[PDB]
Ligand binder design. Sequence first.
Ligand SMILES: O=C(O)CC[C@H](O)C(=O)O
Ligand code: NI
Ligand SMILES: [Zn+2]
Lengths: 12, 348
Amino acid sequence: PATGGVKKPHRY
Amino acid sequence: LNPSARIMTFYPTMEEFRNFSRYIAYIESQGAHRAGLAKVVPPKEWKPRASYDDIDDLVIPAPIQQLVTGQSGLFTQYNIQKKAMTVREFRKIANSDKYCTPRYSEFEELERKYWKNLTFNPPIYGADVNGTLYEKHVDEWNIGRLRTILDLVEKESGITIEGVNTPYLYFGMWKTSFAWHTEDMDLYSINYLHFGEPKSWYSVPPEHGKRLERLAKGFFPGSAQSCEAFLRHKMTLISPLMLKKYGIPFDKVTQEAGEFMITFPYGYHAGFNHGFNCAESTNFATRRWIEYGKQAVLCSCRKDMVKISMDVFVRKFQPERYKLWKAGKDNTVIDHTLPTPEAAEFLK
Ligand SMILES: O=C(O)CC[C@H](O)C(=O)O
Ligand code: NI
Ligand SMILES: [Zn+2]
């Protein structure tokens, strides 16, 4: 989709 | 307005503190946005919460141990997720002798110790925790609901981008850090230090942001080759000594409990916490942001990265440029000096 995701960066 | 482009601090009255977007327009008409970062001390009468003693059971689902590898002022941070824990348990470890703030006299000293031991004794950071410590009764500068044109994303597409259009909590401890970056979609951001030890910031004037990106690109060739916007990975740390050495203009400021910090579009910043504390943050926008949002360089080497369709904003606030924009023929060039249009009220 065109809008979305989340600020929290990918964590190891 | 602020030729020095130095970080500015403001002291609004309760009457000025009530209209959020209007005050932002005011400080921008004073050149606050030039430094890419500004501090706003709220009126003494203002309090977002009555007391912060009723949160010891608050859960920090995904704490991260911050491992750092590097040398000569250039570092890369790897955030290792640890088992969930409550604020109570985090507070105990944060204040423990092994992770507690070192002894010092002046900030310059603590700053030196930070850059000296940042790769040693990896700290834990209760970062990106969904939630707010604001009492649902407060209507002034409420991070959970600022009412800026950014709401168009939720109110129109029914999409919620956590941390961007929703509040995030950050529980830090000595040496915990946030790497160099600009907000997603180069939006604004608001940071309030609820309580605890301070948080120091480093900021690069937006009008000089490109030369920081080029310096970063140079230092990390591989990362750049794999992703033009690798800095959005939020894993890059760069010391002020390195910045000065390569001629990158910048300034520093220390935020205290009870103070607000505002970052502006394309404003690069990074920093660290002096000790146990808690901050609430979220993004927001103004009419001036739209252009930055349209030209924002994005990261696509990863999934789940924040992506916002600029269609609703261009169509609404730039109807006479929409057709050319959709056609990919919009050649607008941004002037980082200009304040948001809403500031014309304070220009006369
Ligand atoms: O305080 C942190 O850990 C990150 C704060 C964020 O960079 C902001 O712009 O509010
Ligand atoms: Ni930020
Ligand atoms: Zn990427």
